[PDB]
Copies of this chain bind each other. A is one copy, B any other.
Amino acid sequence: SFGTPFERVELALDALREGRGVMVLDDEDRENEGDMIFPAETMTVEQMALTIRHGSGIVCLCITEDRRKQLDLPMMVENNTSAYGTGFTVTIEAAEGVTTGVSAADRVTTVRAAIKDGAKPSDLNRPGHVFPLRAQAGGVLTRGGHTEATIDLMTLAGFKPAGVLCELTNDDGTMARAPECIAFAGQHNMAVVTIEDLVAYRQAH
């Protein structure tokens, strides 16, 4: 890489603000993945389209524990037995403005439905094809995962604490590793930052 943890985080924040996305890489001894993330408020149909096309296709919406209650999306399992304690809630669908809810456009509508000011639970049907992740309070200083990094990022950048995220994926079905992600981030002018970088930053500030 290049530069300090700190300028990478600031470029990250500019990117988001600028409508560009971010590639968030994490601990090579963890997920070892990089996530294409964008703010729920700005992510374009075109962008969502590229995330379905090059990501896992399992495109998630990072939300706060406080918005989770507002929409009343129960956590998915009470005995979350998952390796990463990943914070899946019940899945969602825009209650209208969509169809099968799986096209790019439909998922963006659903994200906007979820993030709207004054968004009420009736605004969402269940189940659906957008996957909310409840970010652990204290973000990356508490839990050091993509979910948290996202919210920490929206928050610093000045947005609502809500972000779309998805794993980069080699055409062969294997996960993209660091080198791949960074070239891809390169080609799409999304700022590369790592969870190490954001934990360094928050602490510092």
Q: Mark A82-106, 1 if CB is under 8 A from B, else 0.
A: 1110101011010100111111110
A30 to chain B, nearest CB (A): 9
- Residues of chain B within 8 A of A52, CB atoms compared: 56-57, 169, 173
Interface residues on A, range: 35 or more
Question: In the complex the two chains form, is A33's CB within 8 Å of B100's CB?
Answer: yes
A175 to B103, CA, bound (A): 6
Q: In the complex, which residue of chain B has the Cβ closest to the Cβ of A48?
A: B173
Question: In the complex the two chains form, is A100's CB within 8 Å of B167's CB?
Answer: yes
- Residues of chain B within 8 A of A79, CB atoms compared: 126
- Residues of chain B within 8 A of A127, CB atoms compared: 76-77, 80, 82, 86, 88
A126 and B80 in contact, given A102-B167, A167-B102 (Cβ under 8 angstroms): yes
A74 to B201, CA, bound (A): 41
Contact for A173 among B104, B166, B171, B175, CB less than 8 A: B104
- Residues of chain B within 8 A of A105, CB atoms compared: 173-174
Question: In the complex the two chains form, is A100's CB within 8 Å of B175's CB?
Answer: yes
A127 to B76, CA, bound (A): 7
Question: In the complex the two chains form, is B58's CB within 8 Å of A126's CB?
Answer: no
Q: In the complex, which residue of chain B has the Cβ closest to the Cβ of A94?
A: B83
Is A70 an interface position by the 8 A CB rule? no
Question: In the complex the two chains form, is B90's CB within 8 Å of A76's CB?
Answer: yes
A-B contact pairs, 29 of them (CB 8 A): A31-B100, A32-B100, A45-B173, A46-B173, A49-B171, A50-B173, A52-B57, A52-B173, A55-B57, A57-B166, A58-B58, A58-B129, A76-B90, A76-B127, A77-B126, A79-B126, A80-B126, A81-B95, A81-B125, A82-B125, A82-B126, A82-B127, A83-B98, A83-B100, A83-B125, A88-B127, A100-B175, A104-B172, A104-B173
List the 4 closest A-B pairs by CB distance, nearest first.
Answer: A57-B57, A104-B173, A49-B173, A88-B127
